[PDB]
Amino acid sequence: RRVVAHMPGDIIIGALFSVHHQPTVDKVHERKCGAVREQYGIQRVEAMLHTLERINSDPTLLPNITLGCEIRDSCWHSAVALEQSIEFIRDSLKPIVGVIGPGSSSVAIQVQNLLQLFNIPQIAYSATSMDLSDKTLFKYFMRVVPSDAQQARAMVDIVKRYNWTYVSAVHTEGNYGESGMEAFKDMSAKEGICIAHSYKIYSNAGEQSFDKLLKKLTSHLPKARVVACFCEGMTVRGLLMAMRRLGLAGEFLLLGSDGWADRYDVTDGYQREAVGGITIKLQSPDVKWFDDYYLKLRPETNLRNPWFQEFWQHRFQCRLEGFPQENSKYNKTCNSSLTLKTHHVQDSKMGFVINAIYSMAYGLHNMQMSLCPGYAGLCDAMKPIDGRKLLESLMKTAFTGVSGDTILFDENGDSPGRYEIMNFKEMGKDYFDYINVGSWDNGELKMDDDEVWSKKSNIIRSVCSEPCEKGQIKVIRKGEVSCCWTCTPCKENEYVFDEYTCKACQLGSWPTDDLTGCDLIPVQYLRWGDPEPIAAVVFACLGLLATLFVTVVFIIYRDTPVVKSSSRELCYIILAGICLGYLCTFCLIAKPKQIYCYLQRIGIGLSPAMSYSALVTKTNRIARILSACAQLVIAFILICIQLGIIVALFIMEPPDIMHDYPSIREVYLICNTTNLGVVAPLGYNGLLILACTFYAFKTRNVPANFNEAKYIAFAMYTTCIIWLAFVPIYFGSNYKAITMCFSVSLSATVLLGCMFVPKVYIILA
C-alpha cells in the first residue's frame, strides 16, 4: 500500500502532489512510480504541512478549529492519482472535505470526474487547460491560476512580434498539450502565422520516440527553425536529450510553455542544447517564510513527511545509517554537515500551492461565518460539512494572497493571473540561466528585444518563402498551405492586379512604373524633326524654288515666238500641277488631323493625274499635227474624271484619324487611307502614263524649237520606271507617308525639268 502523510485536525483536507516520477512506459500496468521529486514533490508536501500549521497558529483564521491534512502521491499519472482519490472518498462510501488537486490537467480531470459525484470541491494550482473552465462538467473544480486561453494568446503574440510565420508545433499527449495546441492553432491561423506540421508525443515515451520526433522536426529544418512546444517539462527534456544524441546544438529555437517555464531540472546537463529558448512562466514571487522553514529541516527530526529521508538520500547521494531508510545503494554515508541551503532552488509554483491551501481555508472560514455567526468553532450546524455549501462559499470568497494581491474566483472557477517571459541564456562561460526578458498582462505583451538577441542577427525568421512582392514577380501557391509560394514573373505587357494574379493591359496600353497600374502609351505622329523627313522637306522646298524660277522665266518671256508655239495655258496648267505636287508633299508631312488628312487624298489624286492629262493633249496635238484652244477643255475634263474617283472614294472613307498598332507596344495615328483608297487614283495615273506611252513612242525625236520633243519624250521615260519601282516598297512597309512624299516630289522634279527647262533654259540663255 502506498504511504500517506497525515496531520490531525477537526477538518481534513486532501492534497495530491507528485512526490515521485511518472511510471516508465514499461511499468504503467504495475503503477510503479519512478524517482522522488524535490521541486514538484517534497517541497510541496512541506509547504502544505507548514502552511496548515501556520493556519492553525493564526487566531484570526478558522479560530478554535484545527485544520488537518491527508497528503497522497499522484506520481503525475492518471491511474495512481485515481486510486489515491478513491482512497480519499473511501470513508464517504473522518471525511476529506476538499482536495488540493493535482498539477496536471489530465490528472485533474480524472480526479475531478470522481470527486464531483461526492460533492468534494477541488482547487488546483497548476492545471491550466481550457477544458476545466467548463462548469457543466467540472462544477466542483476551481484554480488559483488563469486558463491557457491567455497563454496561447501570449505565445501567438511572441511569434507575431518577431516576424515568425512558418513555425512547427509540438505538444505533449494529454489534455494540457491538446487544448493548448488547439488554441494556439486557432488563434495563429487567424493572424497569418503558419504551422509546418503539428506533432505529439508522450512525456514517458522512450528515447527512440523522441529521436523519431526530432528527425521529423529536422525534416523542415532550413525553413521551420522555430518549434512551439505546448510541451511538458519532461517532453522538452526529451527533445533536448534527442538533440544531444543526434548532434543538434542550435538548429532550433524552442518556444516553451508553462510546462517548461524556468525549470532547472529540464536543462540540467543539456544547457548547450536549450540555449536561446523562450519560455512562458506564471508570475509568482518567491515565498520567504517557506524558504526559512524548509532549509532548517533535518532527516533526523522530520518524521511527519514519510518520503523525506528517501529524498535526503536521493538528493545528497548518500545513506542515513541510524534509520530504517538507510538504502545502501548509495555508497558513502551522510555526515551531519549536509544542508539543503546549498544549490537550493524553490519551485516556481510555490506561491500558487500555498494560495490554493489558503482558499480552501478561507472558503471554510466564510462558510462557517454564515452558518453559525456567533459560535466560534465547529457548530452543530456543521457536523456534516456540506460540499455544495463549501463550493458556493469558495466561489464567492476573496482573500489577500501571500504575494500581496487579492485571490478571487470568477464565474468560470478560474483566477486572474499574468505571465512572464524567460530566455535561457549563457550568461558567463560554462554558466547558464533563465533571464526575465519581458512579461504579458491582460493582453499586453512587453518584451525586451535588447537582452534576447543582443545583436541585429536574430534567429532566422521561420518563414517558408521570402517576401516576393518585387514588382514584376507575383506569388502562386503550390497546393500546400497558403504559406509556401513560388514566385513567377508575368510578361512585359502584364501588370500586377493583386499579389496573386497578373493581368494584361489594353490594346494600346502599357503598365506604369512598379507595374502597379497601366498607362495608354502615347500615339506617335510624323515629327518635323528627324534626319529622314528633313531631307524630304528640303527636297520639296528646292522643288518649289525651281518651280517659282520656272514661272518667273515663263512669264518674263511670255510672248516670245520661241515659247509661243505650244499653248501657254497648257504649260501653265502643268506648272500648277507640278507646284501642287510639292504642296501635297508639304501638307502630307504633318499631324494627321480631321482638317489635314484629306488634303493628302486631293494631292495624290490631282497632282500625278492632272499634269499628265495636260501633257497628253499636247503630245497628241504634236503627234497628229505631224486643236486650237479646244485642247484646253478636253484637258480640264481629263482632270475632272480623276476629281470624280477621289470623291467616289471620299464617301465610303471620310477623313478620320485611325489608330494602328503593328505591335503590342507602339501606337501610330494616320488618316483612314486603305488599300483601295490608294490604288484607284494610282490605277488611273497608270492609265495616264499608258496614254502618253502611245504618244511618246510615236513622237520619239522631232526637230522643234530647242528640240523640245527630244527631251520631253525622255522626262516621261524616266518617270514610269520610278513609278513602277515605288509599288513594292509602298505595298509592304511602315513608312507610307514619307514614301509617298518622296515619290511625288521625285516624278515631280523630272517633269518640271524636261517639261519647262529645255525651253526656258535656252530661253534665258
Added chain:
Amino acid sequence: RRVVAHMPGDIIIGALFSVHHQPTVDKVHERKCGAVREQYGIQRVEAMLHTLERINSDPTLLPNITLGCEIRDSCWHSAVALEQSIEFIRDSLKPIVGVIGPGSSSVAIQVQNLLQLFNIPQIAYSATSMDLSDKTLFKYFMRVVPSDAQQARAMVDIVKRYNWTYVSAVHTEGNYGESGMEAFKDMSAKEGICIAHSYKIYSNAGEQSFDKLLKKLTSHLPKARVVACFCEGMTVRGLLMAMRRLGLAGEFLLLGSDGWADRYDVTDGYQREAVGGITIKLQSPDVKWFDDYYLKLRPETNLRNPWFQEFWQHRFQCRLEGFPQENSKYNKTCNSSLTLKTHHVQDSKMGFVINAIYSMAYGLHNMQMSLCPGYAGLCDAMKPIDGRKLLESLMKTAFTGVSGDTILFDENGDSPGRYEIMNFKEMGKDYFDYINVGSWDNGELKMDDDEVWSKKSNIIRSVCSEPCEKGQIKVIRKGEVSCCWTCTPCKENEYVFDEYTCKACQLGSWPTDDLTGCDLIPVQYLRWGDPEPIAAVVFACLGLLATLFVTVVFIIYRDTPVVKSSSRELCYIILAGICLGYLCTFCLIAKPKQIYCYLQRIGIGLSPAMSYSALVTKTNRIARILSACAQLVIAFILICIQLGIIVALFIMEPPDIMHDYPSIREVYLICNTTNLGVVAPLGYNGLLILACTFYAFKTRNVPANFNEAKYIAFAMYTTCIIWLAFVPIYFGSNYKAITMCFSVSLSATVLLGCMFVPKVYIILA
C-alpha cells in the same frame, strides 16, 4: 438510490445499459436521467437476463455453476456510469468478475479507467472508438466490434464513389465522434476530399444550439449539399428537428454513421427531412430466439426486471392499476390484450450484446478447463477468481456466436466485422423505410447505385468548382481550400504543364491539339512554283535565251569588220557575266542548302562586279583614245579584288542554313547571309559604278561605229538608279530572296540589251 436488476449465482457478472435517456442539460448536476428506452434499454436488460439462463441451462458451457448478474443503469452518461461502476467495485474495497461495457465510447473510457484498477475485465458491444484499442491505457478492455478506423474508411469510400468533393462535417462532442471525425478528416484530406467546415455539438444541446448549427450548415448550402455526421442518433434527430423548425426539406443529404444506423427512433415524425440519408450499420442478423421469448413477456409476471413496468406504461400510453408503479400521469388503463408483438423492432446491436456475454462465458469456461480439468465446478484454486488470468484467457477465446460466425479477439482486443450501407427512402405513400443498398468489408465497397437514385439525376454532387479541363483553361487556387478554384485561360502560345500551371513552348514551337503537348511547327521556304517565283524565273529563262542568242551572233560575226573595234574578248567577258548573273538566281530561289548558298553569295558578289569592271576598262580605253591587248590585264585584276572581299567575307561567315523566326507563329530557313555580308560586295560594286560614271559622262555623245558609245552613254546611266531603287526594298522586307532574284536579272537586262543588242541589230542590218 438507483435501482438494479439482480440474479444470484456463484460468479457474478455486472452490466451497464442506458435504460433511461441522457440527463437534460439543465439537470446534469443532479444526475437524474430522462425517459425509458426500448431498444438500448429494456431489450438489452432482457437479453442479459435470458442469455444467462441459456448459459445456466447448458451443461456443455460452465457446468454445475450458475452465472448471476447485477445490471445497472448508466443513462448513456459518463458520470452516472462512473457512479454505478463505483457501486460495482465497492466490494473490492460477492465481487464482480467482469462487466458488459456501456454502449458509449466516452462512457466506456470513463468506466475502464476505474475498472482496470481492480483487474475487472470489461467487454463492449458498441464502443467502436479507436481510442480504446490502445492496450497501454485500456488493458482490461475488449470488444466484439471493429474500430471506427474501418468505419471512417467506409464513409471515405462512399464519398469518393459519388464524386463528393466539397462536403460539410458534423460530429458529436465526445470520444466516438471526435475520433471518428479525426480519422475521416485524415483519410479524406489525404485522398481527394475537401471539408467546407467541421462542426461539433453535444447530443443533449438545446433547440437554439441545433438551430445555430443548421444555420452554419446552410452557409455552404449551394456547394456542399452533403453533410458527414460521425454523430450519434440523438444528434441526427436534433438536426432533423432543426430542419423541420426552419423549413429545410431536402437541401442536405446526411451521411450518417453507426450512431444512426437504421434506428427508427431518430427519424420518427421527421421522415420528410431525413429521406435520402445514407447511414452505416454494423451487420448483425436478428437473433431469432430472443423474439420468441421477449414477445411473450407481460408486466404481470416479469418481476425480475425493475424497469419493465415503467417501460410497459411508457410504450402503451396507459396505467397499470393493479401494480405499485401506477404512474398516474397517463389517462386510460391498459387492457389485458396489449402485446409487444405489435410494432416490435429489435435493435441492430442485439447479437453483439448477446455475443458479449458469451465472450465472458467462454472466458470463464476456458479458465475452468485450464485451472482444474478434473473438477466440474469451482475448484479451490479458483475461489478468488483472478481478473488477470480471466483477461489472459479471455484474449485467446475463440467460439461461435448466435449468428453462426466465429468470435475471436485480435492483439488489441477488437473483433472483425463488416458494414451494411442503408438508405432512408420513401417506399410507398406516407411510408419510409431503411433499405440495404450496399456493404463494406476489409476494403471492398459493394453498392447498388440503382436502388438509391433510380436515375442519372442524383443529389447535386457536393462539389465546389466545376472542372477546369476545358482545353485551354487551367486551375488557380486563391489560398482558401484546395477544391475551390478559378479558371484562367492560357494564351495561345503556352501549353498546360500540369492541371495548375501552363508554360510557354519553345520560340520555334506550337502547342498541339487539346493543349496536351507541344509539337515542332513546320518550316516554310520559297517553294519552287508559287505565284511570284513562277513569274520571276520566267525573267531568268528569257534572259538566258537572249544571252545565248546574242552570244551566237557574237561568235558568228567575230571577224566581221563592223565589229572590229574595242576588244571583243572584253565584251565576251561581260556577256559571260550576264550569263553568270542569270544563272545566279537558279541557285538562289530554291530550297536553302549549303551547296546553293555557298554559290549564291559568289554570284551576287562577282556577276555585277566583273562585267561592270570590263565595261570600266572598255570605256576607259574609249575615253583615253579621244591599252592594246593589256586591257584584260588591267580588267581581270579588278575582278580578283572583289573576289578577295567575297573570300574575305566567306571565311568569317561560312555557308550554313540558320532558322529565322519573324514571329512565334512563322518559321523560315535561310543561309547566314547577314547585313555586313552584303554591304561590302555592294560597297565595291557601288564604288566601281561611281568610278565609271565619270567616264560615261565624259563620253556623252561621241560619233563612233554605228553610234556604239551612245547607248552605253545612257543605259549605264540607268543601272545606278535601279540598283539604288533595290537598296531600300532589300533592307526592310521579309522577301530578301525574291528581291535579289528580281534585281540581279533586272540589272543585266538593261546593260545586256544596250551593249549586245544594238550589235545584233547592225549585224542583221
